[PDB]
C-alpha cells in the first residue's frame, strides 16, 4: 500500500524495468494483450528512490532465486529448453548469479504479474 515503499519488476517482452517507490498497488494488477492493451500495475507512484531500464530486446523453463541479505537484493537465473507438460525434468545443472541491487526495502510479501491474451 501507500504506507510503505515497494519494489516492482516488469517485462514488456522487449524491456525490463525496475522501480523502487512508495507505490499504491491496484490489488488486481495484470497486463493485457489484444500489441499490449492493458497495464494495470499501480494506482499511484510518487517519491521515487530508484529506477532502472534496459535495452529494447510448454516450450521453455526459466528458474530464478530471489533473496535479501542486509539490504543487498540478489537475483539468480537460469534458462533451459523444456518440451514436457507437467513433470520436473531431473538432470540438475548449475545455476548462475545474475543481479545485485541496493534497493533495501522491508520485504515480507510478494506476488507475480501475468499477461492475459484477449
Amino acid at each position: 500500500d501507500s504506507k510503505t515503499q515497494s519494489l516492482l519488476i516488469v517485462n514488456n517482452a522487449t524491456n525490463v524495468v525496475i522501480k523502487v517507490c512508495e507505490f499504491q498497488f491496484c490489488n488486481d494488477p495484470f497486463l493485457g494483450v489484444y500489441m499490449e492493451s492493458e497495464f494495470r500495475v499501480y494506482s499511484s507512484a510518487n517519491n521515487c528512490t530508484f529506477e532502472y531500464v534496459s535495452q529494447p530486446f510448454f516450450k521453455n523453463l526459466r528458474e530464478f532465486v530471489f533473496k535479501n541479505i542486509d539490504g543487498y537484493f540478489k537475483i539468480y537465473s537460469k534458462h533451459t529448453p523444456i518440451n514436457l507438460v507437467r513433470d520436473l525434468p531431473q538432470g540438475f545443472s548449475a545455476l548462475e548469479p545474475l543481479v545485485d541491487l541496493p534497493i533495501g526495502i522491508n520485504i515480507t510479501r510478494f506476488q507475480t504479474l501475468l499477461a492475459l491474451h484477449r
Partner: protein, 48 residues
Amino acid sequence: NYNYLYRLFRKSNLKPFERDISTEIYQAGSTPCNGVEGFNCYFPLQSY
C-alpha cells in the same frame, strides 16, 4: 534551521541499511491511533 528532521518513535529496532521513511502515528500506550494525533500518539518526527 528546522528543515532537518529525525524520527523519535518506532516500535522496534532497525536492520542495517534500512530506509525508514514512514510517517505513521506512533502508539505510546494502549490507546489505538485512530488516524489522528493525540495523547500517547505523538508524531514521530522532530526538528533539529
